[PDB]
């Protein structure tokens, strides 16, 4: 996270760390959506340009964390993966279209003060909140700068950007399965996600029922926090039919 701040304790209890077993390192972010299901970006698991193709046994999910590198004894919970499900129409070749994956845990995670699921939006919440100017929150343990690494979970609040402004900022083709966020060079404020924050959630607090909803998944950007560039997020609601299909077919 670039131009963010340290998260408060229990501020993002759905935040999940995707952790590589060997060498021991942070791979990505992810989010807890039930006691058995974790949501992340498909590119965190499969990205052939970088020779990335992780299998279940290669990874651990660490839930309830705050410190990036420390083992947070009696707080964090470490879970093993039962199965990885990548969107069948995930487009790693061009623009990371449908950058979404689900991970089913071997055992259910016990909820606590530091571990709690985020909601998934329904059509009404998405239509009400996914609007230009409305701000969401991005969290992660990723790089602090494009060209170092934080001691604890970082947080940044960022405004959703108008689709024409998103499209005009880049040469990449932007799809309806993406939305973009960040400040315009003229706004004065800064911030973005960066490498290592992918798979993490873009959340919004509904002013109707006071619950936190995961509207986006940290996906891609041209660098980190560049003027005139924006961060791109997977549109969770647009891919909810796939989410529900996977959960309905492979059990909750």
């Amino acid at each position: 996270i670039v131009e963010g701040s340290d998260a408060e304790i229990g501020m993002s209890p759905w935040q999940v760390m995707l952790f590589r077993k060997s060498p021991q390192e942070l791979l990505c972010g992810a989010s807890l959506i039930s006691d058995r299901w974790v949501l992340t970006a498909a590119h965190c698991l499969l990205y052939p340009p970088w020779d990335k193709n992780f299998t279940e046994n290669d990874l651990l999910v660490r839930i309830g964390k705050h410190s990036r590198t420390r083992y947070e004894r009696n707080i964090e919970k470490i879970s093993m993966l039962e199965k990885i499900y990548i969107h069948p129409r995930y487009n790693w070749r061009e623009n990371l279209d449908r950058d979404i994956a689900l991970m089913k845990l071997k055992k259910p995670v016990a909820f606590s003060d530091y571990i709690h699921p985020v909601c998934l939006p329904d059509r009404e919440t998405a239509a009400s909140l996914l609007q230009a100017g409305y701000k969401g929150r991005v969290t992660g343990w990723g790089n602090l700068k494009e060209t170092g690494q934080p001691s604890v979970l970082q947080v940044v609040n960022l405004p959703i950007v108008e689709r024409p402004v998103c499209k005009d900022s880049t040469r990449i083709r932007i799809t309806d399965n993406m939305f973009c966020a960040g400040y315009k060079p003229d706004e004065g404020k800064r911030g973005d996600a960066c490498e290592g924050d992918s798979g993490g959630p873009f959340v919004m607090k509904s002013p109707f029922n006071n619950r936190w909803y995961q509207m986006g998944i940290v996906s891609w950007g041209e660098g980190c926090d560049r003027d005139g560039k924006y961060g791109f997020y997977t549109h969770v609601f647009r891919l909810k039919k796939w989410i529900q299909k996977v959960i309905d077919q492979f059990g909750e």
Binding site: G10, M11, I33, F111, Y114
Partner: peptide, 29 residues
């Protein structure tokens, strides 16, 4: 847990607000 989703034990469950959630609410016009 769908029923209780998105309600934080250290915040919403205790009617405590975090330091920057007000910035999100203010943006929802």
């Amino acid at each position: 847990g769908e029923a209780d989703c998105g309600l934080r034990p250290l915040f919403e469950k205790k009617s405590l607000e975090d330091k920057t959630e007000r910035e999100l609410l203010e943006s929802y016009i």
